[PDB]
């Protein structure tokens, strides 16, 4: 017969390598011009203690190191990128600390000196968190961090520490969306009640390798001195999540799911009435102050009735 040639090992490696990368779901920024821009937009990092999450090939890492940073600590999950980061540390001695870990669990409360901590009401501290992370990591990460801001712990034991982070365009858009927008949703309230949030700019997907199917938003967050709602994070999260579950219906429908069926007509009516909200507002028109009212009223209902808080409407739906 006549059969095709064997692959060379070079071809085999290329095959294994490309497939290896088309997994992992990182969107590499291999362009120092863009990583320079991200760092520039984050603000001055002069004498700042920087925490970079998931540096990967280290484009953002190089841009940070060039910004008169006091110190940079990076946490990286994939060992494959670690020796490249090591090389980088050797080029800037004393400047770069590398940790092989998971940004979702790694605690940085003791990573920088205690003397750099600042009161909550003071200006934000010389700690800044910067990161270009996989979309599947950055969403739960910001949610963990928002709860940390609520508790004033985690990265927020230093004070009102700043974040500059990439997200998919649409997640970026939800984070800064205001009332009445199709994007004003659960994440809009969660971030905005706790932080000042600004969408710095958008980077086209084409700029990343591999090319994701969406664009990438760069978002800056600074914790608020006075948060817009003062109730436990999990309470706010529950009200907000219930408020938004049915987007094209009166908000009464979503908020009603906070209450067992047997009291739902009366209780949902009372919640809206004590909160002083039109029960026919669609969720997108619910503002931070509506949510403050809703959460305050719900808190008192929970205190009067300790069965309320762990009520789950789907469990009831199982007859």
Curated annotation (Swiss-Prot):
Residues 1-18 form a transit peptide. InterPro entries: KsgA/Erm (IPR001737), rRNA_Ade_diMease-like_C (IPR023165), rRNA_Ade_Mease_Trfase_CS (IPR020596), rRNA_Ade_methylase_Trfase_N (IPR020598), rRNA_adenine_dimethylase (IPR011530), SAM-dependent_MTases_sf (IPR029063). Belongs to the class I-like SAM-binding methyltransferase superfamily. rRNA adenine N(6)-methyltransferase family. KsgA subfamily. It catalyses: adenosine(N)/adenosine(N+1) in rRNA + 4 S-adenosyl-L-methionine = N(6)-dimethyladenosine(N)/N(6)-dimethyladenosine(N+1) in rRNA + 4 S-adenosyl-L-homocysteine + 4 H(+). One of its GO terms (biological process) is rRNA methylation. HAMAP family: 16SrRNA_methyltr_A. It comes from Mus musculus (Mouse). Its main location: mitochondrion. Mitochondrial methyltransferase which uses S-adenosyl methionine to dimethylate two highly conserved adjacent adenosine residues (A1006 and A1007) within the loop of helix 45 at the 3-prime end of 12S rRNA, thereby regulating the assembly or stability of the small subunit of the mitochondrial ribosome. Also required for basal transcription of mitochondrial DNA, probably via its interaction with POLRMT and TFAM. Stimulates transcription independently of the methyltransferase activity. This is Dimethyladenosine transferase 1, mitochondrial. Keywords: DNA-binding, Methyltransferase, Mitochondrion, RNA-binding, rRNA processing, S-adenosyl-L-methionine, Transcription, Transcription regulation, Transferase, Transit peptide. Disruption phenotype: Mutant homozygous mice exhibit embryonic lethality. Conditional loss of Tfb1m in heart, leads to loss of dimethylation on adenosine(1006)/adenosine(1007) of 12S rRNA, decreases steady-state levels of 12S rRNA, induces instability of the small subunit of the ribosome and abolishes mitochondrial translation. S-adenosyl-L-methionine binds at residues 29, 54, 76-77, 102-103, 132. Interacts with mitochondrial RNA polymerase POLRMT. Interacts with TFAM. Remains bound to the maturing mtSSU until the late stages of assembly. It is found in: Mitochondrion.
């Amino acid at each position: 017969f006549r059969l095709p040639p064997l692959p060379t090992i070079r071809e085999i490696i290329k095959l294994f390598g490309l497939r290896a990368v088309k997994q992992l779901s990182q969107n590499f920024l291999l362009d120092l011009r863009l990583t320079d821009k991200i760092v520039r937009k984050a603000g001055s990092l002069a004498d700042v203690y920087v925490y970079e999450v998931g540096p990967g090939p280290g484009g953002i890492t190089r841009s940070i190191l060039n910004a008169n940073v006091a110190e940079l600590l990076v946490v990286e999950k994939d060992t494959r990128f670690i020796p490249g980061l090591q090389m980088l540390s050797d080029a800037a001695p004393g400047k770069l600390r590398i940790v092989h870990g998971d940004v979702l669990t790694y605690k940085i409360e003791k990573a920088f000196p205690g003397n750099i901590r600042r009161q909550w009401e003071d200006d934000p501290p010389n700690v800044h968190i910067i990161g270009n992370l996989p979309f599947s990591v950055s969403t739960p990460l910001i949610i963990k961090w928002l709860e940390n801001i609520s508790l004033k712990d985690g990265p927020f034991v230093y004070g009102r520490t700043k974040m500059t982070l990439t997200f998919q365009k649409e997640v970026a858009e939800r984070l800064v969306a205001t009332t009445g927008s199709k994007q004003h949703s659960r994440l809009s309230i969660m971030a905005q009640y706790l932080c000042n949030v600004e969408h710095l700019f958008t980077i086209p997907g084409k700029a990343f390798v591999p090319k994701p199917k969406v664009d990438v938003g760069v978002v800056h967050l600074t914790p608020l001195i006075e948060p817009k709602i003062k109730q436990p994070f999990k309470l706010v999260e529950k009200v907000v999540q219930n408020a938004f579950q049915f987007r094209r219906k009166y908000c009464h429908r979503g908020l009603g799911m906070l209450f067992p069926e047997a009291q739902r007509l009366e209780s949902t009516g009372r919640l809206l009435q004590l909160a002083d909200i039109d029960p026919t507002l669609r969720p997108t028109h619910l503002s931070l102050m509506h949510f403050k009212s809703l959460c305050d009223v719900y808190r008192k209902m929970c205190d009067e009735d300790p069965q309320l808080f762990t009520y789950n409407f789907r469990e009831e739906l199982k007859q």
